[PDB]
Amino acid sequence: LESLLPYYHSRTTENFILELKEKNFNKVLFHIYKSENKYASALSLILETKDIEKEYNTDIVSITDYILKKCPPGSLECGKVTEVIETNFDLLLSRIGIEKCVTIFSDFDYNLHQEILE
Amino acid sequence: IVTEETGVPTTSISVNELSPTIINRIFIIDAKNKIISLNFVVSSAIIDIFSTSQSGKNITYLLTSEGV
Numbered sequence: 648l649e650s651l652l653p654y655y656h657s658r659t660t661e662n663f664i665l666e667l668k669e670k671n672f673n674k675v676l677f678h679i680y681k682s683e684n685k686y687a688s689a690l691s692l693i694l695e696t697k698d699i700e701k702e703y704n705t706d707i708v709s710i711t712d713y714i715l716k717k718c719p720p721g722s723l724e725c726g727k728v729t730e731v732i733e734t735n736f737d738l739l740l741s742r743i744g745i746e747k748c749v750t751i752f753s754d755f756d757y758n759l760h761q762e763i764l765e
Numbered sequence: 766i767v768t769e770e771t772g773v774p775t776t777s778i779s780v781n782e783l784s785p786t787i788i789n790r791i792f793i794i795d796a797k798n799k800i801i802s803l804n805f806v807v808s809s810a811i812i813d814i815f816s817t818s819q820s821g822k823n824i825t826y827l828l829t830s831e832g833v
């Protein structure tokens with residue numbers, strides 16, 4: 648199904664997304680989300696996908712860095728990124744760990760370190 | 766041994782174009798004790814290997830595309 652995407656430029660509606668969500672391909676969704684640079688929902692897919700396969704087990708810390716490699720100057724749509732990070736802080740530490748999480752949050756936002764007292 | 770990898774593809778990185786083939790990396794594995802002898806880079810490629818010497822010591826020879 649991946650090869651059809653460049654030829655499928657005549658149709659990129661949300662209806663195609665519904666079928667992939669139903670069958671949970673977990674790869675075409677990430678590939679599509681990289682195109683329009685939404686980066687929000689795909690970020691959920693970074694931890695939503697319980698399985699690993701090839702999309703995971705590689706660059707696990709670096710995938711988070713790459714998705715966080717966005718909006719250098721200012722907020723620029725990353726406010727929802729901060730809010731979804733805040734709302735899912737607890738299970739994030741379960742996957743990545745502890746020592747890497749503080750290093751990742753150090754260069755991004757000190758206030759994100761505030762959400763530790765709960 | 767001689768090793769050819771030509772980069773590595775993954776979802777996180779983006780392949781800009783047809784990346785030039787990284788030149789062969791050469792390893793010399795050792796028996797008995799576990800150690801790596803040498804690891805350097807060559808110019809273009811390898812055609813054939815001779816690897817002979819009459820003396821007590823032994824020497825090896827490689828021939829690349831342009832010829833070294």
